[PDB]
Write a protein that binds this DNA or RNA. Sequence first.
RNA 1: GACAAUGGUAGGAGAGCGUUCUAAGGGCGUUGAAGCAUGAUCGUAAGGACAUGUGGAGCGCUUAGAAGUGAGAAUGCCGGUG
RNA 2: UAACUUGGGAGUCAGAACAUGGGUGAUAAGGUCCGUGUUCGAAAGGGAAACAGCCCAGACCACCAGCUAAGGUCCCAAAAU
RNA 3: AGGACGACAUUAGACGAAUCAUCUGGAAAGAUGAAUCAAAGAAGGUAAUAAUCCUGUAGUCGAAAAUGUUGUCUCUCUUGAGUGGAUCCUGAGUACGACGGAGCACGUGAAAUUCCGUCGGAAUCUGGGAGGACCAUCUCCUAAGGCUAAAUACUCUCUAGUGACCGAUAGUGAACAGUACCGUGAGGGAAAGGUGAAAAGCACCCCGGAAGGGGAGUGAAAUAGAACCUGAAACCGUGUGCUUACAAGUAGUCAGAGCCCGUUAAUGGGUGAUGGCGUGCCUUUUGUAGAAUGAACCGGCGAGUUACGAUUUGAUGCAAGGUUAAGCAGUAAAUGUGGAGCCGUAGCGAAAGCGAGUCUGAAUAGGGCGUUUAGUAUUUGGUCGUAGACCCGAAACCAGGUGAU
Lengths: 206, 116, 146, 64
Amino acid sequence: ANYDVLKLDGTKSGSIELSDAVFGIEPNNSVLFEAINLQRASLRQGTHAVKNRSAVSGGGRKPWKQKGTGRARQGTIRAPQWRGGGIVFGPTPRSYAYKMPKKMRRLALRSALSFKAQENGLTVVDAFNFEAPKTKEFKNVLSTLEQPKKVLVVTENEDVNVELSARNIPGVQVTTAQGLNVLDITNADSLVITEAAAKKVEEVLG
Amino acid sequence: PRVKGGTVTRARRKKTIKLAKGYFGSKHTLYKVAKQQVMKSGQYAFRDRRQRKRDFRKLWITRINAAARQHEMSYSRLMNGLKKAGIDINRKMLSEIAISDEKAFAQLVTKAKDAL
Amino acid sequence: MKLHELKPAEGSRKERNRVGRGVATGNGKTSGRGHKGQKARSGGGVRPGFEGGQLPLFRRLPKRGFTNINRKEYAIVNLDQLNKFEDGTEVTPALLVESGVVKNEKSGIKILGNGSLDKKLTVKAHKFSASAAEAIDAKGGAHEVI
Amino acid sequence: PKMKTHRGAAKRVKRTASGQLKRSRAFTSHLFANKSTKQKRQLRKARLVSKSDMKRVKQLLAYK
RNA sequence: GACAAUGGUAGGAGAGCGUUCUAAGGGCGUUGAAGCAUGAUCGUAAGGACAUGUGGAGCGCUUAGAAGUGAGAAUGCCGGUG
RNA sequence: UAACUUGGGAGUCAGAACAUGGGUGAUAAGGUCCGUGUUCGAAAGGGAAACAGCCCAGACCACCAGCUAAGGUCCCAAAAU
RNA sequence: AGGACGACAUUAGACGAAUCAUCUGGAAAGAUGAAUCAAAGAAGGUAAUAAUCCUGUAGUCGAAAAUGUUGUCUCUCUUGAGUGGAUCCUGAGUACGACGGAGCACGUGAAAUUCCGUCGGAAUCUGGGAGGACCAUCUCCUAAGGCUAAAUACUCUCUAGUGACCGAUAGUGAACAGUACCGUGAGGGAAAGGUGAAAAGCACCCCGGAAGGGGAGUGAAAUAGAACCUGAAACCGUGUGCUUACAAGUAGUCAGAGCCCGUUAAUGGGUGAUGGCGUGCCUUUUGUAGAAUGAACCGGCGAGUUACGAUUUGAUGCAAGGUUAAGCAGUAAAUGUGGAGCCGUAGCGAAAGCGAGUCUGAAUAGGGCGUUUAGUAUUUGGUCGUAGACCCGAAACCAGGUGAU
Ligand SMILES: [Mg+2]
């Protein structure tokens, strides 16, 4: 439960004690699967439709007589087997979202975070200090403490300059201790979390 | 999303068309009659793989019968005598011997005659 | 898990049956409906409980009784759910609720005696059963109908 | 929408501790002269809905 | 490994093939993608490749998700041609 | 080597010929209504010239191996002039 | 009612960082190599696929004039309490009632409560109305005059955007139209997208009246030439390797000479003298080669779906407990918060009620249903209910119109 706290250059500062109740459980893969499936199903707007018999234009009268002409009996020029139109069972506008008990939501977050801490994907830093936004400066920080290409940066509260500097780098995502979700954590290769943000995460999830 | 039928129907039908190469007239051109004919021909082939085994056995017995009448025996008594002698040669081998080697077949006939 | 290696829990998912899609599935032409009749038609079921004209079951049996709209009903607490308290405690309806022994108190608490007490308490509820009041005043302690 | 209870059935049965349905008896209420005394006495006890009938009328009483 | 079983209509149960779209990963393509045409190829089946010609800019693979997901018949509807 | 109990999902409610015990009809019907078996229905293969229901027999797939069933052995056409 | 001075927002706009070289090629944005910007790596163009070529984007700036909001002044109006309480005032053809109807979840009923037509027709604070016939006591209120924002419903439109929505038989009937056309009229109602990067859209010669064509030329390509991307099948032809004029057929299959070829190279390919066996498919039937139904042929399109409830099975979380709904915050997400409510931990009885028991019964008898624990939330699959509910098809019924050319 000890983790080094680096500086913005790779030099070491004090250690820290993160709870084994949050970082360090045995990850549950069933609940992770259901949580990822839920989050991604809640992002689609089911805006799709077709016109059925009633909604197609025209088609009120009977095309020809029921008997006597030698043709098949027909009822309207907008029946489904006509080239004109009329769809039988197409898409209709609907929602795809659903819900899980909240004890399961917390378990999914805990098991996604602990998986990063057992693959050496967790990096704790003391503080971010950016006076003005500058992407070239953030790129060098990410390269100094060698990070993979896909990184999730977590701050304690919304930090305008840090969030605004890592905005145009492909592969980097910035969030807050309370905006943590299962899709962002598992999509990343490594986490770069500050000390204050780590303490804050350790309580709300504990 | 919409799934329009594309390219699977044509490929499936063209396989059956190609299986009907050599058939008469529109039976090698049009899908419906071609499919019916290919079904019927599969059924015929199944039935005939089993009739082949009866036809060839019937041919061998005819040839053995012809070869045995030249030594004043009928097929019936020749096979009886060969069994009583213990000989276990096929009807297929017994008629290839009679065709290629007449002396060996004569020696078989003498043993069949002595066991009766 | 990685996002390119997801697997669901074994036994949790299953593919739906699609009917009327060819002969080899086993549900092709008639789609599991058999041959002609009322039940093979679109929207063709008959009403649940209908018996083809024979007098239905819930018309040859007689009606019985009435309902009392002023009926009371009590939240029940048996005698062995009081063993999670310490001796001397004053067990009150406000305490049974916060302790999570009673979720909903409908017309008031009523104590019944089904287990064993093995504690010395002072209980105050709306109603008691003879056995409950007897068993409370056997380890010491009393009861007060409030 | 929600499913609707069959009111006439709800006025005639009640549910026991297991899933059973207790019911009342026909051939009461009238013409008691053509009965013996044993018949009248034994028509007074209650019975259960049979299992072959449960199969038919079971969604009718799902909310009871 | 020994032994046994394996015809089938209404119908019950199981395991799969292929089509369009999405996510993540990893690839191919003007040194020629999809489509189309031909072949004497591979798999127990649905089906999958490879080579050559035509074509001239897009398309597979792995795992998971979602469906306007598969036609030979309806005196079916539209077009073309006998 | 099955049977029973509880629960999920059905389809079926037009049957036919043959043998045998009977009614009806005329000790008529490839008639009609019941009892008892079998086969077809949903069963290919061999025999009965051809011939759903008669006789022998129940096809997982190869093979130009062998033994038999019903029925057969002058030629058509396998096996005794 | 109407003046002043402001502040925002619309209705045109402006500035806006950073790349070169070689290879293939008709052309580079591709490949290879070396660089740069990022509060900008959204998107679209450009002779193929571009953060750095163009239009843009992040960011920042901008209004002569007219609207729309919104402030601060001006402006314009205006006293407010207490005690006495029953002297005076307090909504009349009204409230009610009978008869005939209607609306209230409620079918005139134990019908209280609320309206319309026709007739009757009160009381005045010790008053009057309601609390589901009616009476008494209690409790709550004060009819027969009027006005009133917000939270709620909808979209022919306008502005800015979005999609595990369609991609020319689809999506609007309509990508080029309520037009061809049909009908006296009301009315019905189509088919029809694609040269190329750039028109560079074929100068000139030849045959021909022309139409068409062969050369030459343009182009990377003209079997990209305007009936112009790709160009399947039915169908129509030309040339050929094997075969056929003594033969009786659901057109194949198994056996098999002869002749001709040479492959995804393997106990290969094409044709077929002659022999054996062999009455299409689908639907519907006790039973169909059937002389029972359907299909000229080829292509495209064309039928168990979704929402909300119920039940059962699998999976997963927690467990004597399990779980939130609307709402609020958040990016039209995850999530956080929200404990009204729901199921379970206890049943029996018509009910009062009693309670590990309870009902029946005079009974401490006997019997029925119970006790001697496992539930709950979400979700995959099966089935059911309410919805057109697997798809196509009547003869008819009703409403509102158009017709005596
Ligand atoms: Mg031709």
